[PDB]
Design an enzyme around this catalytic site. Structure first.
Site, PDB file in Angstrom:
ATOM      1  N   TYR A   1      62.889  38.056  32.473  1.00 42.09           N
ATOM      2  CA  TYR A   1      63.227  39.028  31.419  1.00 42.09           C
ATOM      3  C   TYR A   1      61.824  39.470  30.859  1.00 42.09           C
ATOM      4  O   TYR A   1      60.956  38.645  30.778  1.00 42.09           O
ATOM      5  CB  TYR A   1      63.951  38.370  30.423  1.00 42.09           C
ATOM      6  CG  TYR A   1      65.319  38.217  30.752  1.00 42.09           C
ATOM      7  CD1 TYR A   1      66.078  39.183  30.781  1.00 42.09           C
ATOM      8  CD2 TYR A   1      65.985  36.730  30.817  1.00 42.09           C
ATOM      9  CE1 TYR A   1      67.466  39.022  31.180  1.00 42.09           C
ATOM     10  CE2 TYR A   1      67.353  36.579  31.048  1.00 42.09           C
ATOM     11  CZ  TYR A   1      67.865  37.839  31.237  1.00 42.09           C
ATOM     12  OH  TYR A   1      69.418  37.416  31.825  1.00 42.09           O
TER      13      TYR A   1
ATOM     14  N   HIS B   1      75.501  40.981  36.923  1.00 41.64           N
ATOM     15  CA  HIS B   1      75.434  39.655  36.003  1.00 41.64           C
ATOM     16  C   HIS B   1      76.568  38.893  35.869  1.00 41.64           C
ATOM     17  O   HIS B   1      76.851  38.058  34.950  1.00 41.64           O
ATOM     18  CB  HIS B   1      74.853  40.139  34.638  1.00 41.64           C
ATOM     19  CG  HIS B   1      73.780  39.222  33.936  1.00 41.64           C
ATOM     20  ND1 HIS B   1      74.224  38.059  33.596  1.00 41.64           N
ATOM     21  CD2 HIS B   1      72.872  39.738  33.655  1.00 41.64           C
ATOM     22  CE1 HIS B   1      73.141  37.617  32.864  1.00 41.64           C
ATOM     23  NE2 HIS B   1      72.057  38.529  33.025  1.00 41.64           N
TER      24      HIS B   1
ATOM     25  N   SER C   1      65.920  30.750  37.126  1.00 40.64           N
ATOM     26  CA  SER C   1      66.316  31.397  35.920  1.00 40.64           C
ATOM     27  C   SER C   1      65.289  31.502  34.804  1.00 40.64           C
ATOM     28  O   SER C   1      64.584  30.405  34.786  1.00 40.64           O
ATOM     29  CB  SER C   1      67.612  30.947  35.461  1.00 40.64           C
ATOM     30  OG  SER C   1      68.308  31.833  34.973  1.00 40.64           O
TER      31      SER C   1
ATOM     32  N   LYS D   1      67.028  43.446  39.163  1.00 40.34           N
ATOM     33  CA  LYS D   1      68.437  42.805  39.344  1.00 40.34           C
ATOM     34  C   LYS D   1      69.067  43.412  38.171  1.00 40.34           C
ATOM     35  O   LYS D   1      68.906  43.545  37.044  1.00 40.34           O
ATOM     36  CB  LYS D   1      67.967  41.429  39.145  1.00 40.34           C
ATOM     37  CG  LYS D   1      69.360  40.435  38.927  1.00 40.34           C
ATOM     38  CD  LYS D   1      68.866  39.181  38.829  1.00 40.34           C
ATOM     39  CE  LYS D   1      70.082  38.110  38.693  1.00 40.34           C
ATOM     40  NZ  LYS D   1      70.768  38.233  37.394  1.00 40.34           N
TER      41      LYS D   1
ATOM     42  N   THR E   1      65.426  41.342  35.497  1.00 37.29           N
ATOM     43  CA  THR E   1      66.575  41.483  35.332  1.00 37.29           C
ATOM     44  C   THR E   1      66.796  42.694  34.019  1.00 37.29           C
ATOM     45  O   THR E   1      66.001  42.504  33.341  1.00 37.29           O
ATOM     46  CB  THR E   1      67.472  40.435  34.548  1.00 37.29           C
ATOM     47  OG1 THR E   1      67.348  39.342  35.658  1.00 37.29           O
ATOM     48  CG2 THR E   1      68.856  40.497  34.082  1.00 37.29           C
TER      49      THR E   1
HETATM   50  C1  LIG Z   1      76.243  30.424  33.961  1.00 37.08           C
HETATM   51  C2  LIG Z   1      75.432  31.672  34.431  1.00 37.08           C
HETATM   52  C3  LIG Z   1      74.167  31.748  33.851  1.00 37.08           C
HETATM   53  C4  LIG Z   1      73.254  32.986  34.155  1.00 37.08           C
HETATM   54  N1  LIG Z   1      72.108  33.011  33.672  1.00 37.08           N
HETATM   55  C5  LIG Z   1      71.380  33.822  34.046  1.00 37.08           C
HETATM   56  C6  LIG Z   1      70.018  34.246  33.538  1.00 37.08           C
HETATM   57  O1  LIG Z   1      69.425  33.383  32.947  1.00 37.08           O
HETATM   58  N2  LIG Z   1      69.156  35.310  34.038  1.00 37.08           N
HETATM   59  C7  LIG Z   1      69.912  36.082  34.875  1.00 37.08           C
HETATM   60  O2  LIG Z   1      69.060  37.244  35.300  1.00 37.08           O
HETATM   61  N3  LIG Z   1      71.106  36.124  35.198  1.00 37.08           N
HETATM   62  C8  LIG Z   1      72.124  35.161  34.898  1.00 37.08           C
HETATM   63  N4  LIG Z   1      73.202  35.161  35.471  1.00 37.08           N
HETATM   64  C9  LIG Z   1      73.638  35.851  36.469  1.00 37.08           C
HETATM   65  C10 LIG Z   1      73.152  35.215  37.659  1.00 37.08           C
HETATM   66  O3  LIG Z   1      72.098  35.633  38.082  1.00 37.08           O
HETATM   67  C11 LIG Z   1      74.135  36.153  38.857  1.00 37.08           C
HETATM   68  O4  LIG Z   1      74.096  37.686  38.724  1.00 37.08           O
HETATM   69  C12 LIG Z   1      75.884  35.908  38.945  1.00 37.08           C
HETATM   70  O5  LIG Z   1      76.018  34.489  38.726  1.00 37.08           O
HETATM   71  C13 LIG Z   1      76.516  36.339  40.164  1.00 37.08           C
HETATM   72  O6  LIG Z   1      77.904  36.031  40.303  1.00 37.08           O
HETATM   73  P1  LIG Z   1      78.757  34.645  40.739  1.00 37.08           P
HETATM   74  O7  LIG Z   1      78.472  33.815  39.774  1.00 37.08           O
HETATM   75  O8  LIG Z   1      79.957  35.217  40.860  1.00 37.08           O
HETATM   76  O9  LIG Z   1      78.096  34.356  41.826  1.00 37.08           O
HETATM   77  C14 LIG Z   1      73.797  33.863  35.087  1.00 37.08           C
HETATM   78  C15 LIG Z   1      75.211  33.660  35.674  1.00 37.08           C
HETATM   79  C16 LIG Z   1      76.030  32.669  35.345  1.00 37.08           C
HETATM   80  C17 LIG Z   1      77.380  32.319  35.783  1.00 37.08           C
HETATM   81  O1  LIG Z   2      74.318  35.131  31.808  1.00 39.61           O
HETATM   82  C1  LIG Z   2      73.796  34.200  31.026  1.00 39.61           C
HETATM   83  O2  LIG Z   2      74.380  33.091  30.575  1.00 39.61           O
HETATM   84  C2  LIG Z   2      72.444  34.547  30.627  1.00 39.61           C
HETATM   85  N1  LIG Z   2      71.837  35.420  31.282  1.00 39.61           N
HETATM   86  N2  LIG Z   2      70.559  35.558  30.682  1.00 39.61           N
HETATM   87  S1  LIG Z   2      70.381  34.478  29.463  1.00 39.61           S
HETATM   88  C3  LIG Z   2      71.852  33.877  29.680  1.00 39.61           C
HETATM   89  S2  LIG Z   2      72.515  32.514  28.613  1.00 39.61           S
HETATM   90  C4  LIG Z   2      71.484  31.805  27.475  1.00 39.61           C
HETATM   91  C5  LIG Z   2      70.712  30.654  27.447  1.00 39.61           C
HETATM   92  C6  LIG Z   2      69.707  30.002  26.572  1.00 39.61           C
HETATM   93  C7  LIG Z   2      69.594  30.901  25.673  1.00 39.61           C
HETATM   94 CL1  LIG Z   2      68.481  30.458  24.503  1.00 39.61          CL
HETATM   95  C8  LIG Z   2      70.334  32.093  25.426  1.00 39.61           C
HETATM   96  C9  LIG Z   2      71.104  32.546  26.553  1.00 39.61           C
END
Ligand SMILES: Cc1cc2nc3c(=O)[nH]c(=O)nc-3n(C[C@H](O)[C@H](O)[C@H](O)COP(=O)(O)O)c2cc1C
Ligand SMILES: O=C([O-])c1nnsc1Sc1ccc(Cl)cc1
Ligand SMILES: Cc1cc2nc3c(=O)[nH]c(=O)nc-3n(C[C@H](O)[C@H](O)[C@H](O)COP(=O)(O)O)c2cc1C
Ligand SMILES: Cc1cc2nc3c(=O)[nH]c(=O)nc-3n(C[C@H](O)[C@H](O)[C@H](O)COP(=O)(O)O)c2cc1C
Ligand SMILES: Cc1cc2nc3c(=O)[nH]c(=O)nc-3n(C[C@H](O)[C@H](O)[C@H](O)COP(=O)(O)O)c2cc1C
Ligand SMILES: O=C([O-])c1nnsc1Sc1ccc(Cl)cc1
Ligand SMILES: O=C([O-])c1nnsc1Sc1ccc(Cl)cc1
Ligand SMILES: O=C([O-])c1nnsc1Sc1ccc(Cl)cc1
Lengths: 360, 360, 360, 360
Positions: free
Chosen positions: D132, D258, D108, D234, D158
């Site tokens: 990103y 997401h 991530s 994505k 993403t």
């Molecule tokens: C706690 C959490 C943090 C995430 N952080 C990111 C991120 O930083 N970047 C991103 O592209 N997707 C992020 N996602 C989306 C995940 O890549 C993914 O699309 C999603 O977790 C898939 O669904 P699932 O949790 O049901 O397996 C996040 C999802 C969760 C639950």
């Molecule tokens: O689904 C998610 O939680 C996420 N997706 N991209 S960033 C993110 S959470 C997040 C973490 C750290 C910061 Cl500084 C901003 C946002």
């Protein structure tokens, strides 16, 4: 209170109250999140009945036949393993009740009673053997030969269990046979709780050691050559597989998802039954199990083209209540509910139960 | 508190609070798992209303006719047995309320009041007799002749009860008439709680002894020859049966699943009504019962082609609250709700309630 | 705790905690069993969004116009009566918040503030009058003339309330204005709680005395001749009625089921919106109210062809929290949620919100 | 008791019991009313399996490839930010478990471990970077160059987060990094809880400062020119966007909402997957995430044409239980459930998982 059990659900509730949790859970469970387990029952509710009025239903006749053998009703006992866990008399109680009712019993391959013992207890009962193809084909052949010798009238070969389904409660409970019991048709092959069957469900490990996951239609060819008994493929859910079973010279399909205990997320049996009936083009009888609890379930299955249905869990709940008498009670309740459903829908016999009686 | 009952559901809740459990359950129950009982109400909710605006609804007229007799509203009292269990005045209270409202009462065949007593109590009321064809055809003919003599204007022959449905609570409760009451139009035929009616529902055994399960369309021919009164077939759920009723010279269809008390898993009446209306091609009036609780239910039924609806349980809840006054209250609530539903949908009278008002 | 209210539902929960039950219930209620009330919200959930990625949403513009007048967002305040029951400042608080937000307020005809008072409080606010056609057409004409004189920019004529719907809680609660308040645009016409308005809902009796249930399209012709202001028909649910409104020279349709407070069992507004948009063939603007609680609701309505939406209850919950500031909070939450929904779906302005964004 | 965790849901329940509420909620949450969050799981249940019997499943092979790199199973770790909040070892634990399993990890961009640290911990692990496009394109380019240098094999860009979704619990909880942790690939860009990130979700403010909401397909052109690494888009939910990604020379689509954390009310990923697979005409691999919890979910996704699936939350629950060992446990459970689902459906390898295995 004193038990006043008037429908199959009441027998289950009683069973839950008297059985050890591990044993009740083993009997109750479906696979994984139990989606199919719920659907086997919910699907029957979605099929609606369109009863005909003023048909003369004074003399309802429930009799039919299964693979050429007469039965008193299109409601038969399906294979459920290890029945002595529910009542000391287990499979002997079940077969005696079937004899009284004039219906058939499908003896399970991991029965807690022998093929011979069951035949001795129910000599006049219609009896069939449910078979797995074991890695040891000599074991397998011996079961078939004993069934032949002891007056069994068909083989139901189960085809949906190359491995055991994942029943979460059994894993949580670390399920195993009570110490006094064994699979009586075989130490390891007898599923002795004394043997090493891993740290999860003892049953899954036993299956992995015993049942052959490599079997193909070639093994069906072998079984067809081995015996002249009628053979039914048990666990078919697809029309194409049903057609293959016909092509291999089998004599029936039991449309079954193994009581929702194998692959979770398959359809309800009542929902796939029409596809299978259509696919076999009347060439073999088609049966159903999975979720039959009420007389209207039986009626719906026959309307959609099943020759007869099998009941699994309800029989075990009968045993848990009162052995032979309890099984007789459950079968009599199903019989009477089916009689009433027939009468209220305008059906004086099973031959006039037609597809216009139901719509989804 | 003091009862402030403003809708039909409130009357049911009050009834549950004051009636003995056995009596409430007898009135409430459907058959088996009560799938159809739930659906009779849920199905009305799935039919949506498409109201017309700006139609002039200052002078709403609810009047209509049933089999040539004028009524104040398309909402009539359906047959419910043994009304004296709900209130000392039973059927006499009901008929007096119908007289006040200007609507009709369908007198049940196992009424706790005689055909003559009801006529004496409601001489100006529109009254019809609900009939079963008893094994004893002399009993049956006498009921019809008394209805004729005592100013009843139609026969509703119930065709869905060759045997009684299986209402589980009645079996659990071992239901029977309270000792002071009898079916007043006949000891055994009067359903005396002193007589031997088995160990289950007393009612089911009574029905099995009294009602003829052999009846066919030939018996409808007999009834049609027996009386010149209008005859309505009550309990039809199939278009083909509806067409047969027309062919036999009957004068109406009451689309009914017997309040969901007979075969469980049949469709809701509101869902089969369109099929039946289409099948009879305007040749006879079509009525509905089952699940009518609100003015919008009435509106939906009329939009789909019913001439009028009948209410069963709501009337019993009225009795349980306050006899004649309670029945009047329930009928007035239904009347006012129907008036409001008509007005808000742009209907100044029942003749302009059309099929474009509803969509499923 | 200290209220931390971050979505519209939180404002409702707060309102329930601080308002007298009778007042909360009056605001909350739908008609009868509240089937449509539930559906107005559930229906939005069934419409799914199909967002476009990588569209450049750095500079989202929410502005649009309503009947030729610019607004900051396609989210406007709908008519809700008697707002001083929620907060001492009532309609004056609401109009001040609308002025701050740059959106419009639809002033209700049974407002607890006068047409003049509201104009004085929000001189720069976009303001419209919601009108009923009263039996007294002189009353009716005076309201229209005052709206004209005091800078209101449209008339929304409500056409779905020839009589008031049956809101059960109001009847149970015997609802009436608190003693200090009056309908300020008229003793009886002012809905004085001192006057005789029956023993049920005071409101229903008031409506029956005041509002003309006889009105037809002829009365729409009258209103169209009476004023050159834009006129919107409020409460249309059918395409044919929508076409009639266009034919009568009206300038918009507000697709509305009156917050599910009139006829219960009509469809959700979001579900009938497409039919109405299609029927009017772009000839007038189409608006929606009923169940708007979230930014994605707004987006879905615009995708299906609404020019703007109106919110009823959320505004009242804003008042109950903190008068003008509370209404501003609710409108700002809706604005920000809508901005985010637009951005995440690839929409930089309202002109690019297309029908491919949604599927049911 | 002692934790006996045998399915992914058990790991979540354990996580809820041991994690601070704010942290659990951050991981758990979806956007707004969490309609899509529920649907990502419910939608899998609606796709039913049609298993083939008698296929020979003695030697099930789960191996496949992702963008030309072999993996042990079609089940890979998706990007979840800030994993050190769940376990001290965070992303280093995750990558070590992936190395053990023979599957890939998507790192991530707001990881609590650096690109270099993760490569050092899992040198033999298949690793990809989730990117990103930051307003600062120099930051963005540096991440890509570090991924190249440190042996990462693809970029997952993403595209569904121009702004952060509105996760209500994070706002209620005023969520921020624990004081000891930072985003290790960048004070403000590192999301220091010491910096000013507003009074709501700290995360939303951080995103608004860092991520470029203006990006278009022109920026995809830039990224495609910047690196020869495979690039996967994505967050695509529409067929037309999928076709555009192919046209821009991208190498895969990750069908993703997401984890239901961005726009609420979009469809479940399993429901849009067929549209996307059809739209790309085999030109790039298509992957799925969102709601994968069970082996049958994996099977259904592959039947509908996904090459592999990614899991988000389950991995975090593994960490919360026991770091590296916990992640290994979760991946092994998914692997074994998938193996069993394959075997029970007649699939000896991933190449024979066909569309006839499923029906909605
Ligand atoms: C706690 C959490 C943090 C995430 N952080 C990111 C991120 O930083 N970047 C991103 O592209 N997707 C992020 N996602 C989306 C995940 O890549 C993914 O699309 C999603 O977790 C898939 O669904 P699932 O949790 O049901 O397996 C996040 C999802 C969760 C639950
Ligand atoms: O689904 C998610 O939680 C996420 N997706 N991209 S960033 C993110 S959470 C997040 C973490 C750290 C910061 Cl500084 C901003 C946002
Ligand atoms: C406790 C239990 C044990 C079972 N054991 C076997 C078995 O040994 N062999 C077999 O082919 N099927 C077995 N089955 C499946 C049943 O034959 C039958 O398919 C299933 O019970 C039908 O569904 P029902 O329980 O809803 O009636 C078993 C089912 C249950 C509930
Ligand atoms: C308590 C009760 C007794 C009934 N008794 C009779 C009867 O004697 N004969 C008959 O034809 N139908 C009888 N019915 C069926 C009713 O005529 C009618 O079909 C039903 O009540 C309609 O549904 P509702 O109760 O939802 O209004 C009875 C129904 C109930 C609830
Ligand atoms: C408490 C309340 C009072 C209302 N009063 C009026 C009224 O006086 N005139 C009118 O045309 N509509 C009135 N309505 C209907 C609203 O204009 C609008 O159609 C409805 O509130 C929209 O649904 P919503 O509350 O879900 O946003 C009222 C609605 C509510 C909830
Ligand atoms: O559905 C079921 O429970 C079953 N089906 N076949 S064996 C079985 S249970 C079982 C019983 C005994 C042994 Cl040793 C292994 C497994
Ligand atoms: O639906 C109902 O309850 C009924 N319908 N016909 S008789 C009946 S109940 C009944 C009443 C009295 C007797 Cl003796 C037998 C049965
Ligand atoms: O939906 C609503 O509540 C309403 N719509 N029109 S009047 C109204 S409530 C009402 C307020 C005051 C009076 Cl006097 C009568 C009725």
């Amino acid at each position: 209170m004193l038990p006043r059990l008037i429908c199959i659900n009441d027998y289950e509730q009683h069973a839950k109250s008297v059985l050890p949790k591990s044993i009740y859970d083993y009997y109750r469970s479906g696979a994984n999140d139990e989606e199919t387990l719920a659907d086997n029952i919910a699907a029957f509710s979605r099929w609606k009945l369109y009863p005909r009025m003023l048909r003369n239903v004074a003399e309802t006749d429930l009799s039919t036949s299964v693979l050429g053998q007469r039965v008193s009703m299109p409601i038969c006992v399906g294979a459920t393993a290890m029945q002595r866990m529910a009542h000391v008399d287990g499979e002997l109680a079940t077969v005696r009740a079937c004899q009284s009712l004039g219906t058939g019993m499908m003896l399970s391959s991991w029965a807690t009673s022998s093929i011979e013992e069951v035949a001795e207890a129910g000599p006049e009962a219609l009896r069939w053997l449910q078979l797995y193809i074991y890695k040891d084909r000599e074991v397998t052949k011996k079961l078939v030969r004993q069934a032949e010798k002891m007056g069994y009238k068909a083989i139901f070969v189960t085809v949906d269990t190359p491995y055991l389904g994942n029943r979460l409660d059994d894993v949580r409970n670390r399920f195993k046979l009570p110490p006094q019991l064994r699979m009586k048709n075989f130490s390891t092959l007898s599923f002795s709780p004394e043997e090493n069957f891993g740290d999860d469900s003892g049953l899954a490990a036993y299956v992995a050691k015993a049942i052959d996951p490599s079997i193909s239609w070639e093994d069906i060819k072998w079984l067809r050559r081995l015996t002249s008994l009628p053979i039914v493929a048990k666990g078919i859910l697809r029309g194409d597989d049903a057609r293959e079973a016909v092509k291999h010279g089998l004599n029936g399909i039991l449309v079954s998802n193994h009581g929702a205990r194998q692959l979770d997320g398959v359809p309800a049996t009542i929902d796939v039954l029409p596809e299978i009936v259509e696919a076999v083009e009347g060439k073999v009888e088609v049966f159903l199990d999975g979720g039959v609890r009420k007389g209207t379930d039986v009626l719906k299955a026959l309307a959609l083209g099943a020759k007869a249905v099998f009941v699994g869990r309800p029989i075990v709940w009968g045993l848990a209540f009162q052995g032979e008498k309890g099984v007789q009670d459950v079968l009599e309740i199903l019989k009477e509910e089916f009689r009433l459903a027939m009468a209220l829908s305008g059906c004086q016999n099973v031959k006039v139960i037609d597809k216009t009686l139901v719509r989804k």
